Paper text:
Breakdown is then initiated with the conversion of the C‐3 hydroxyl group to a ketone (cholest‐4‐en‐3‐one, cholestenone) by the oxidase ChoD, and further oxidation at the C‐26 “tail” region via a three‐step process involving oxidation to the hydroxyl, aldehyde, and carboxylic acid species. Comparison of the effect of complementing a CYP125 knockout in the CDC1551 strain of Mtb (which does not express the CYP142 protein), with CYP125 or CYP142 reveals that the two enzymes are functionally redundant with respect to growth on cholesterol. Here we present a series of compounds based on an ethyl 5‐(pyridin‐4‐yl)‐1H‐indole‐2‐carboxylate pharmacophore which bind strongly to both Mtb cholesterol oxidases CYP125 and CYP142.
The introduction of the amide group on the 2‐position of the indole 15 rescued some affinity however with both CYP125 and CYP142 these were both greater than 1 μM. In the X‐ray co‐crystal structures of compounds 14 and 15 in complex with CYP125, the pyridine coordinates directly with the heme iron, but in an orientation that is rotated almost exactly 180° around the heme vertical axis relative to compound 4.
Author numbering: 19 to 427
Write the structure that this text describes.
């Protein structure tokens, strides 16, 4: 038995509203790397199966991720915590995004979606996102101080999605609003926000975009997705709507929280910040993602009995891959608790473990991170925090809602 308080639940949103449970994860890696996380009736975050297996070692996370034939994303979705009284149908509706599908449905969709994340398509966004990163930093600097999350972290990830999809500038304001309103629904600051209605408006806008491109096909990603190839595979209008919802959801808070927590790490380690401003190493992005681990945990469901590192996982049981624990696995990383922007190799699982569902936007995220921190170094090299950050109440997402900083220093 690990040295934990009785009834500790690693998906408890009340934990992450206050802290990352780093020491509790380290105790599991030390005394029980695969530990049954029991859950009382009605306190399962929408799941009523009694609990889950906490997966805390990077090797075990990687094994689950590559064995998608056994560990299903579709059965219960990949998000391990919602509001306790969520209806089952609201969990299953997530199966319309490819993140919560299994093969062969997932395989078909990913093949089509791959057209949109080719090195070409992502690389073609570099110039506009650099210009936007410089403009964001310059505006924050001119403001002198403010909420780093809103003034520096929030916009560039949304502009990457907008620039990727070819969204007209006049529409990006409401698009960003809908994308942000699907967020942090478990936090009291956003308790009055309806993520269902926001998704419907995203789907409506996306489907109209697909209808415009059906009559006006140009050379852009959206056309390539809604244009049938030789084998006739393509995104239907509604599937494109679900793809945009996925991007607006997947490519938003995660990159944002990487930027905020990366700057928090720089503030806590000024020697690393001084090093970054001089050298600007591209390895910084991956260490920032390891340190930030924006997705604390995703889950899978065992479709058959499976033995994982001497532990018998039974059919139907959930496994929760705690990336936050794996990214600080003492047996994998040299000095895991050291923030080292020059860390290489850096085999973190912040983008998930290698497998069918590995983050398709990983290189877009790295580019966004590298560009915004170059802009921060260019325009506010002496920025200093004003007060402590406010964390997001979530059982699986690692979010910073607000962080007051002084750009002038
Ligand atoms: C630092 C930023 C990001 C982090 C930490 C992150 C993390 C993740 C994780 C953990 C997964 C699941 C891996 C698995 O289940 O094995 C994933 C998948 C995915 N990500 Fe990201 N992500 C980030 C940025 C982005 C961006 C910028 C985009 C798109 C613009 C994106 C789009 C997706 C999609 C579509 C999937 C589903 C892939 C599939 O199911 O086949 N992500 N991401
Ligand atoms: N801020 C949220 O809550 C939320 C954030 C988020 C991020 C991803 C993701 C990130 C990176 N790579 C792949 C996926 C997936 C789901 C995410 N979500 C769930 C929100 N979603 C709202 C409506 N109800 C169901 C849950
Ligand atoms: Cl194996
Ligand atoms: Cl928001
Ligand atoms: Cl990996």
């Amino acid at each position: 038995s690990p040295n934990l308080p009785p009834g500790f639940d690693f998906t408890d949103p009340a934990i992450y509203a206050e802290r990352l449970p780093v020491a509790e994860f380290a105790e599991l890696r030390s005394a029980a790397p695969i530990w049954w996380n029991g859950q009382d009736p009605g306190k399962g975050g929408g799941f009523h199966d009694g609990g889950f297996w906490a997966i805390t070692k990077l090797n075990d996370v990687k094994e689950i991720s590559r064995h998608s034939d056994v560990f299903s994303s579709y059965e219960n979705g990949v998000i391990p915590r919602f509001k306790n009284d969520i209806a089952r149908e609201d969990i299953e509706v997530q199966r319309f995004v490819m993140l919560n599908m299994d093969a062969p449905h997932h395989t078909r969709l990913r093949k089509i979606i791959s057209r949109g994340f080719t090195p070409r398509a992502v690389g073609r966004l570099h110039d506009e996102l650099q210009e936007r990163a410089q403009k964001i930093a310059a505006e924050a600097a001119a403001a002198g101080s403010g909420d780093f999350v809103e003034q520096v972290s929030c916009e560039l990830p949304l502009q990457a999605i907008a620039g990727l999809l070819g969204v007209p500038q006049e529409d990006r304001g409401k698009l960003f609003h809908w994308s942000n309103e699907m967020t942090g629904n478990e936090d009291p600051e956003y308790a009055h926000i309806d993520p269902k209605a926001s998704s419907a408006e995203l789907i409506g806008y996306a489907m109209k975009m697909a209808e415009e491109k059906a009559k006006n096909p140009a050379d852009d990603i959206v056309t390539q997705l809604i244009q049938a190839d030789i084998d006739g595979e393509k995104l239907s209008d509604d599937e494109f709507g679900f793809f945009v919802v996925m991007l607006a959801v997947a490519g938003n808070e995660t990159t944002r929280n990487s930027i905020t927590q990366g700057m928090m790490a720089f503030a806590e380690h000024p020697d690393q910040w001084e090093l970054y401003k001089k050298v600007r190493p591209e390895t910084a992005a991956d260490e920032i993602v390891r340190w930030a681990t924006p997705v604390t945990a995703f889950q899978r469901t065992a479709l058959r009995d499976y033995e994982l590192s001497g532990v018998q996982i039974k059919k139907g049981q959930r496994v929760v891959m705690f990336y936050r624990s794996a990214n600080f696995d003492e047996e994998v990383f040299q000095d895991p608790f050291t923030f080292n922007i020059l860390r290489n190799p850096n085999p973190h699982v912040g983008f998930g473990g290698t497998g069918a569902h590995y983050c398709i936007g990983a290189n877009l995220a790295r580019m966004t991170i590298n560009l915004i921190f170059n802009a921060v170094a260019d325009h506010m090299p002496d920025l200093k925090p004003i007060s402590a950050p406010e964390r997001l109440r979530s059982g699986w997402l690692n979010g910073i809602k607000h962080w007051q900083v002084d750009y002038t220093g």
